[PDB]
Design an enzyme around this catalytic site. Sequence first.
Site, mmCIF file in Angstrom:
data_model
loop_
_atom_site.group_PDB
_atom_site.id
_atom_site.type_symbol
_atom_site.label_atom_id
_atom_site.label_comp_id
_atom_site.label_asym_id
_atom_site.label_seq_id
_atom_site.Cartn_x
_atom_site.Cartn_y
_atom_site.Cartn_z
ATOM 1 N N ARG A 36 0.875 -1.048 0.007
ATOM 2 C CA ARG A 36 -0.069 0.139 -0.150
ATOM 3 C C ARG A 36 0.657 1.238 0.113
ATOM 4 N NH1 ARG A 36 -4.229 2.625 2.898
ATOM 5 N NH2 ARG A 36 -3.583 4.288 1.269
ATOM 6 N N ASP A 69 -1.596 -0.473 9.435
ATOM 7 C CA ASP A 69 -0.654 0.484 8.422
ATOM 8 C C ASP A 69 0.879 0.520 9.344
ATOM 9 O OD1 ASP A 69 -2.735 1.779 7.208
ATOM 10 O OD2 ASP A 69 -3.383 2.501 9.183
ATOM 11 N N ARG A 70 1.160 -0.011 10.321
ATOM 12 C CA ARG A 70 2.256 0.150 10.714
ATOM 13 C C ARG A 70 2.783 -1.317 11.725
ATOM 14 N NH1 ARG A 70 -0.126 4.439 11.628
ATOM 15 N NH2 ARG A 70 -0.782 3.922 13.779
ATOM 16 N N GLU A 195 -0.051 16.754 5.795
ATOM 17 C CA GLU A 195 0.153 15.151 5.998
ATOM 18 C C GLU A 195 0.395 14.894 4.278
ATOM 19 O OE1 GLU A 195 0.135 13.207 8.224
ATOM 20 O OE2 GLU A 195 -0.858 14.062 9.857
ATOM 21 N N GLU A 196 1.469 13.906 3.903
ATOM 22 C CA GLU A 196 1.462 13.339 2.648
ATOM 23 C C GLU A 196 1.591 14.152 1.372
ATOM 24 O OE1 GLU A 196 -2.017 10.943 3.261
ATOM 25 O OE2 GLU A 196 -0.994 9.474 4.262
ATOM 26 N N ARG A 211 -2.189 17.182 2.250
ATOM 27 C CA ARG A 211 -3.403 16.897 2.797
ATOM 28 C C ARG A 211 -3.432 17.337 4.304
ATOM 29 N NH1 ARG A 211 -4.547 10.348 4.275
ATOM 30 N NH2 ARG A 211 -5.866 10.555 6.011
ATOM 31 N N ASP A 212 -4.580 17.964 4.436
ATOM 32 C CA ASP A 212 -4.937 18.502 5.555
ATOM 33 C C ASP A 212 -5.961 17.352 6.314
ATOM 34 O OD1 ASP A 212 -5.936 19.858 7.905
ATOM 35 O OD2 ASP A 212 -6.423 21.638 7.027
ATOM 36 N N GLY A 216 -9.444 20.364 6.688
ATOM 37 C CA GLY A 216 -9.688 20.808 5.567
ATOM 38 C C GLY A 216 -9.904 20.008 4.363
ATOM 39 N N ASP A 243 -9.964 17.075 -1.531
ATOM 40 C CA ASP A 243 -9.800 15.878 -0.664
ATOM 41 C C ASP A 243 -10.883 15.011 -0.325
ATOM 42 O OD1 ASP A 243 -8.340 14.607 1.403
ATOM 43 O OD2 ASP A 243 -8.205 16.166 2.752
ATOM 44 N N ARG A 290 -13.188 6.441 -1.377
ATOM 45 C CA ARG A 290 -12.028 6.130 -2.065
ATOM 46 C C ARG A 290 -12.539 5.662 -3.386
ATOM 47 N NH1 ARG A 290 -6.981 5.763 2.371
ATOM 48 N NH2 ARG A 290 -7.404 7.855 3.191
ATOM 49 N N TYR A 324 -5.039 6.537 -2.877
ATOM 50 C CA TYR A 324 -4.171 7.671 -2.689
ATOM 51 C C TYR A 324 -3.542 7.996 -4.120
ATOM 52 C CZ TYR A 324 -2.779 7.634 2.234
ATOM 53 O OH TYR A 324 -2.924 7.795 3.547
HETATM 54 CA CA LIG Z 1 -9.147 16.881 4.994
#
Ligand SMILES: [Ca+2]
Lengths: 390, 390, 390, 390
Positions: A36, A69-70, A195-196, A211-212, A216, A243, A290, A324
């Site tokens: 991913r 994710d981790r 972010e990202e 990316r907020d 946002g 977004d 998504r 993404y």
């Molecule tokens: Ca956002």
Amino acid sequence: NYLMLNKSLCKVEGWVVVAKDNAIRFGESEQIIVTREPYVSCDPLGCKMYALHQGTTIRNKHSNGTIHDRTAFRGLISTPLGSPPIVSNSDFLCVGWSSTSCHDGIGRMTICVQGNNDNATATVYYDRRLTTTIKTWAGNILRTQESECVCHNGTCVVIMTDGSASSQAYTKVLYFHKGLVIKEEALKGSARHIEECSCYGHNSKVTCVCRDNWQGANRPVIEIDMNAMEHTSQYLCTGVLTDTSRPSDKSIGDCNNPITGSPGAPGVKGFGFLDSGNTWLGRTISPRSRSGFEMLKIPNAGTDPNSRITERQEIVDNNNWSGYSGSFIDYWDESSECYNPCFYVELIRGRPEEAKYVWWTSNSLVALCGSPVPVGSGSFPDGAQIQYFS
Amino acid sequence: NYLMLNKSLCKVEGWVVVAKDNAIRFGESEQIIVTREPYVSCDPLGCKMYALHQGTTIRNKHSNGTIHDRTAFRGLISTPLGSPPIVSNSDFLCVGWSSTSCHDGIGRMTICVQGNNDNATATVYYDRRLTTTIKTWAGNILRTQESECVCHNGTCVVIMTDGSASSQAYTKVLYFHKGLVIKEEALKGSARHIEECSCYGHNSKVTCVCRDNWQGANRPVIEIDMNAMEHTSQYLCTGVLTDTSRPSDKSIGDCNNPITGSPGAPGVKGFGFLDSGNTWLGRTISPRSRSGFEMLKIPNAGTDPNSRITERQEIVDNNNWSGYSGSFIDYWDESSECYNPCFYVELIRGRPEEAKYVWWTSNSLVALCGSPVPVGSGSFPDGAQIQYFS
Amino acid sequence: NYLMLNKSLCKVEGWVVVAKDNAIRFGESEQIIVTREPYVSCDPLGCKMYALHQGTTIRNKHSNGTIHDRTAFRGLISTPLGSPPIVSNSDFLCVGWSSTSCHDGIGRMTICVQGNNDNATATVYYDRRLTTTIKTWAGNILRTQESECVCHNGTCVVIMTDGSASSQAYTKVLYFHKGLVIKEEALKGSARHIEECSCYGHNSKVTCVCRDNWQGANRPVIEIDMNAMEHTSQYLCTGVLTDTSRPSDKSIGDCNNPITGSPGAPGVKGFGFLDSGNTWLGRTISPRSRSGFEMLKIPNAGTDPNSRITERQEIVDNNNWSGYSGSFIDYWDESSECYNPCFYVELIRGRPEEAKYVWWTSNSLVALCGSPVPVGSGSFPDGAQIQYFS
Amino acid sequence: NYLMLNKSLCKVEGWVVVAKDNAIRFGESEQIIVTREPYVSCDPLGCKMYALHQGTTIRNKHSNGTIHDRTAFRGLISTPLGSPPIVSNSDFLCVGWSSTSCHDGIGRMTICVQGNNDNATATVYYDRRLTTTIKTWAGNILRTQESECVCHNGTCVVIMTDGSASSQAYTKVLYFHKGLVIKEEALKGSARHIEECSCYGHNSKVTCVCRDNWQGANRPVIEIDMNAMEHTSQYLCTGVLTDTSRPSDKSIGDCNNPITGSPGAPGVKGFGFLDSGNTWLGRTISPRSRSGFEMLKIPNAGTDPNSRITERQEIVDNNNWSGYSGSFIDYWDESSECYNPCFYVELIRGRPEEAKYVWWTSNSLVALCGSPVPVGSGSFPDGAQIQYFS
Ligand SMILES: [Ca+2]
Ligand SMILES: *[C@@H]1O[C@H](CO)[C@@H](O[C@@H]2O[C@H](CO)[C@@H](O[C@@H]3O[C@H](CO)[C@@H](O)[C@H](O)[C@@H]3O)[C@H](O)[C@H]2NC(C)=O)[C@H](O)[C@H]1NC(C)=O
Ligand SMILES: *[C@@H]1O[C@H](CO)[C@@H](O[C@@H]2O[C@H](CO)[C@@H](O[C@@H]3O[C@H](CO)[C@@H](O)[C@H](O)[C@@H]3O)[C@H](O)[C@H]2NC(C)=O)[C@H](O)[C@H]1NC(C)=O
Ligand SMILES: *[C@@H]1O[C@H](CO)[C@@H](O[C@@H]2O[C@H](CO)[C@@H](O[C@@H]3O[C@H](CO)[C@@H](O)[C@H](O)[C@@H]3O)[C@H](O)[C@H]2NC(C)=O)[C@H](O)[C@H]1NC(C)=O
Ligand SMILES: *[C@@H]1O[C@H](CO)[C@@H](O[C@@H]2O[C@H](CO)[C@@H](O[C@@H]3O[C@H](CO)[C@@H](O)[C@H](O)[C@@H]3O)[C@H](O)[C@H]2NC(C)=O)[C@H](O)[C@H]1NC(C)=O
Ligand SMILES: *[C@@H]1O[C@H](CO)[C@@H](O[C@@H]2O[C@H](CO)[C@@H](O)[C@H](O)[C@H]2NC(C)=O)[C@H](O)[C@H]1NC(C)=O
Ligand SMILES: *[C@@H]1O[C@H](CO)[C@@H](O[C@@H]2O[C@H](CO)[C@@H](O)[C@H](O)[C@H]2NC(C)=O)[C@H](O)[C@H]1NC(C)=O
Ligand SMILES: *[C@@H]1O[C@H](CO)[C@@H](O[C@@H]2O[C@H](CO)[C@@H](O)[C@H](O)[C@H]2NC(C)=O)[C@H](O)[C@H]1NC(C)=O
Ligand SMILES: *[C@@H]1O[C@H](CO)[C@@H](O[C@@H]2O[C@H](CO)[C@@H](O)[C@H](O)[C@H]2NC(C)=O)[C@H](O)[C@H]1NC(C)=O
Ligand SMILES: *[C@@H]1O[C@H](CO)[C@@H](O)[C@H](O)[C@H]1NC(C)=O
Ligand SMILES: *[C@@H]1O[C@H](CO)[C@@H](O)[C@H](O)[C@H]1NC(C)=O
Ligand SMILES: *[C@@H]1O[C@H](CO)[C@@H](O)[C@H](O)[C@H]1NC(C)=O
Ligand SMILES: *[C@@H]1O[C@H](CO)[C@@H](O)[C@H](O)[C@H]1NC(C)=O
Ligand SMILES: [Ca+2]
Ligand SMILES: [Ca+2]
Ligand SMILES: [Ca+2]
């Protein structure tokens, strides 16, 4: 042979697919690595797909639980662009659960963030040798772009973030030379949260569309001068929100404050190319999920609060999952006078969205490059029949 | 080091097998990629097999439905000649459902046509970088050779077609330099319809033997002057018919009009080498079905309406399936004074012809090169036991 | 950089294993290619294993019937020495069911014999390009060494045979330059019959130890002067018999006539290094079956009718299967003053000998090089549990 | 370009993971080669993982019985660092059941010890060519480091041992040039017994931290002057014991005599970096079992009997299996002024410890490099669910 950002973006009228790995389809039987957060990065010798693996393949009992994710079993792999990732064709670059990578024209810099959430450390490599480490500064998931960084005159800029995902965090703009930090800037400007970032270079500058994840549904933007090594930030001006999740588009946007109203998911990695009338933003078709992907031509989206969609191109239809997305450019095409904007879409299959079919999550990839001339149409979804995996 | 077409064809008395991938046999268990429309193309560093993949392997549930010709999950792969295609040994070159490729002596040009049937676009690459796009001009399945193109003095010629498959269409002869179009010609001559040209170079010229899919069981021929960049077209003169399906051979052929009477299938991709007495045409043994394959020596087939078969060599017996066939030459064998004619036969297994055994269709490949001296005999069919797959 | 045979053989006191592919063991699950008639050949860049594949892997339904020696689905592959052969690591070099290959110091020459038994043709390659073809001259299975040929001053010598396997046949000594025949000699000397020569070079000469399949349990020998390009033949003088099957060893051998009495199988490919007191012959432990393998030091075996075994080293014990064996040397070890004798043993598993367990036959490989100093001991059999495959 | 050991060790405050192959996890379905006794070795072109394979993969019936240490089906493979080993990405270097390897800056030397226990022989290679053999001198399992050797000015030092594992044996320090022995020294000093040395270079010297398998829970140390080619030996001075099994740590250690009391297992391969205050030793968390792994900063552990742990970093938690560990350094990082200490941990899964789940034993690998600055935390165990294999 350090890369010099001495070109402007090519004009783009449409987008064509240059690569599609069909990884999930192949992964029904072949030993495709579970991934991913993929991206694409080029260098003088070609282009490769990059992705965070999960330390397992899809048809493997360890694929169960890969929604996580981790883990200590994640890392960065690069594979030839267009090919799905298997062990035989994949380079295992570093260990970690967040990454970026870029080539300065002479050597490649790569970064993997690894470790526990409260005590993570970024491992930085140059030419495949470990050069520096960067300890967490806020103690909450040190993390970076999940797409390629950008270099100019031997210096590569990287955006990193540490701290809370849902409130104020600590974002730093990092400048590297041969994998060594030579300058850092705490985030400046009006962007509330970062972010990202998806970044691209042009005329000695780097532009990041980010990316907020706090407030946002409009995407923060970071603007970098690569000669002075200084940055500022703001939001896209357009009322067209890119977004996910997001409320409906506003007639008037806000260049300096986030636009709230996001019904569900706090964000998704996305990208945009800001070039006056030649401005293009990507976005999922669904404002909730998504799913789907479209490119929107929005003239002066970065400067004009009243800017509007003038052209549109569906890349993935709304009946298919996306994920993404990020920018990349072949900065070493010496036969072209301009930098041709390219991008990728992560095509996420499995959980959470297909939890009733399978126990895993992984992605395939589609990559697009711009064309200055009107092109045709077509939808390029993942293509797997999920029930085959059940 | 641009290739100069400065040699004539070698004399050919017989044909020997230089490669056979046995892809379907291996594909009973190994992860062989599902392909069709294969070909072979060489360059200074060696020769590779090219093919349009279906975004799946054979022992994969996604192999079901691969009779379909155009999906978003197809693309071009190249693999080392002689090897069957798997992910590990295959280069994924572009995305699309129709292609050609050739090397000009310095860089390789490749083309993939992608998108919806009514709005398709050709993606053109040079040295693996996207250089140009060509939108459909007739709005009905923009398409090209499905075998290698040919280059001279830096210019590569490509034949493309757009429009109806069963009536008058719009064929263009395209001249490329470094993946950029430098000249185009609408089809000229008496060829009524053009599909899937098989081309070869010789003495600053390129000769294409093509497929009339509208009216002709005799194959159209395109003749190109590579210095002037001009072409004309006609039909093979011989009454010996080499398309499939076809009626029986006529005592007298027609150099300028198609010969009708085709009982079933409108056509199949084929090839021929036109060199006076040293003239060879390929053809399926069956005049109805894509089964068997023979090489026919037909002196002056390209100039003489009364020309006749003088020699014959069975390549694949009539109890075994064949398919598409096309020409290729190693233009970089500096140790030979002439260009040695070579060809490949696509060996199609599965649907529609074996629909009662399997749900897929795919091919293996056999490649042959000429010999100036009498050679032996042998049949080289696909070799798989289809019932093993049921 | 043409190889010049300017060195003598190193003294050998014992043999150590330099490679063992364990192909059958791996082949219980991994996609190992079904092979037989393997050998080893080196060049300036390293050494590779060569073998005739059967167009299938072991765990594949097409492995059924691979006892057959000649099909249209066989060909030559090379793989890195020490590795078992899979598609990903194997080079598919030519199509056919009999072969040899060698490097002249600049380019590699390879030969595959293909086609029907009564009309076969050898395909000859130089630097991977087809250069010449050689039609059958006797009409009964044109065939060659099944181990590497040897080159000197740009000329490579190859031994070929055409005709009956059980009576008088037609053997030719062929001299190649860049894959072109520059001289041929019909077999001369007292050797009655010649099959599958194992050759090595030394001081501008090539010595071949071969297989008489007609009358002899003693091995024929061919001696070649590489500067004059002339040969003669005889038999090994020793009464120690090294073919299989064979009667018991005689106290007195015969330098010029075959020694009869062979109970069953007419022959097996074998090798020997003839160097006065430094003389070594290989042989299966069983005089009836292709099981076991031992190296015998037999001083002056090539000149002395009364010569006797003085030293012995078991390579594969008699409770394990062996098969073909042949010579090879790294002629490009510029750091050694002599040519170190090396050899391989084909380890045949499956049919006919294990017909009650499996339906296939294939081999693994072990390769040995000499040591001038006393070494240790150990047996190196195939290692697979055949019942795992049943 | 012979490597000159002209640098000191970098200061180390913590350790980060640079590679983790996740071999057992992948091995649930992909064809991962069964290995044990792995290590890492670098050269000017990159770093690779080395390991002794068992001539089989995990999902293969031949994986049954791989607890055995010495078979004829073992050998050394190298694979790209970070990747799990499969046939496609693995170089099969030599045959044997004990090994070391190192690069002198120009060519790589590798050693495999093969044969029966009472008559074993080391095969020595330089640049992949067999150069020398070394027969057993004590007649009981001739054996070497199981991690990389170290080179200086064209000379590479190797520690070997022959004889009883549980009492006095015969250890030799061997000095090689281009794979030829140029000097040997019988073990000198106070080290009673030597097994499996882990070595590293610094300022024209090589330091080896080894395994006493006879009497010592404290690790023997060998110190080598690479210019004079002379060595001596002793024990670590610290009372902190780093072998396994081991009794509790003593307040006072012994620089010259082994510390006894070892409850069970006689030893495990381990490593240490001796650099005054910058001194680090590795050890399993359990003093009984090969489980867990920690790095201990023990200032002057090599000179001070009263030295104590001052810092600690868990690498693998005590609920997870570890195994062998050893040192390696990238000696060709010309961009760093010092040699950065690195190490690997062998993560053993299967038998004997997991005998109730599976019939095999194999390992995965994690590799760590030092950081001069405080880093984060995280545990990096094998990660496989053993019950998936049952
Ligand atoms: Ca956002
Ligand atoms: C993929 O992993 C998940 C998580 O391990 C598997 O689902 C789990 O299946 C086990 C049964 O094997 C369930 O265990 C049970 O839990 C209940 C409490 O919820 C307990 O009372 C029972 O005694 C038993 O231990 C577990 O609940 C369940 N987990 C979830 C989240 O549903 C799943 O089966 C795995 N998939 C495959 C294909 O193996
Ligand atoms: C390969 O794909 C084909 C097409 O999906 C599969 O054949 C199809 O099988 C389904 C049953 O799973 C059939 O569905 C039925 O259709 C009838 C109407 O024709 C409807 O009344 C039933 O309620 C049911 O939905 C479908 O007809 C059939 N399609 C064709 C063209 O025969 C095939 O099974 C697949 N092969 C494998 C090995 O999975
Ligand atoms: C590997 O291939 C061999 C050869 O095809 C297979 O053995 C064969 O098995 C078939 C049955 O499937 C036998 O067919 C029968 O032959 C007799 C005459 O002998 C006939 O009267 C019957 O009506 C039937 O057709 C065949 O005899 C037999 N061949 C031999 C030589 O024994 C074998 O089963 C294959 N192995 C696997 C694992 O598939
Ligand atoms: C992995 O290999 C081991 C060793 O071969 C297998 O365990 C063995 O299983 C066989 C049965 O197939 C046992 O044979 C029996 O031995 C007893 C004497 O102990 C004898 O009286 C019986 O007549 C029979 O021959 C054998 O004892 C047993 N060995 C051990 C050490 O337990 C094991 O099954 C293999 N694993 C797999 C998955 O195949
Ligand atoms: C590209 O990078 C080089 C290296 O930093 C710059 O050259 C340096 O410029 C500084 C002043 O900013 C001088 O003090 C150094 O002496 C220069 N170093 C060398 C090696 O010449 C160069 O100016 C940069 N290019 C741009 C456009 O900023
Ligand atoms: C091969 O291509 C080159 C490049 O087009 C040709 O050289 C050009 O010829 C034109 C006239 O046709 C001149 O106007 C250009 O100045 C030439 N360019 C260069 C770079 O010299 C060449 O003539 C071609 N060869 C043939 C046989 O047509
Ligand atoms: C190695 O091969 C070369 C090429 O054939 C030999 O050189 C030739 O020798 C012949 C006489 O035998 C001359 O007529 C040619 O003019 C030579 N050719 C060249 C290019 O010099 C050479 O003699 C061979 N070496 C040996 C030892 O026979
Ligand atoms: C590195 O190795 C070279 C080669 O052995 C050493 O140079 C030799 O030194 C000896 C004396 O010890 C001389 O007798 C030789 O003539 C030298 N050989 C050459 C080729 O010069 C060199 O001294 C070594 N370096 C160190 C620091 O010991
Ligand atoms: C072809 O697709 C493009 C989108 O890239 C679209 O704008 C255009 O209208 C389409 N053309 C036709 C003829 O449908
Ligand atoms: C060998 O095959 C060729 C076909 O290539 C054929 O023309 C010839 O007659 C055959 N020779 C014999 C002796 O059968
Ligand atoms: C070791 O093996 C060799 C065979 O290579 C044998 O001749 C020798 O006697 C053996 N040595 C011992 C001590 O058994
Ligand atoms: C991070 O981990 C290190 C071990 O490398 C440890 O010493 C340190 O205390 C940890 N920091 C925090 C804030 O937990
Ligand atoms: Ca037709
Ligand atoms: Ca015989
Ligand atoms: Ca101990």
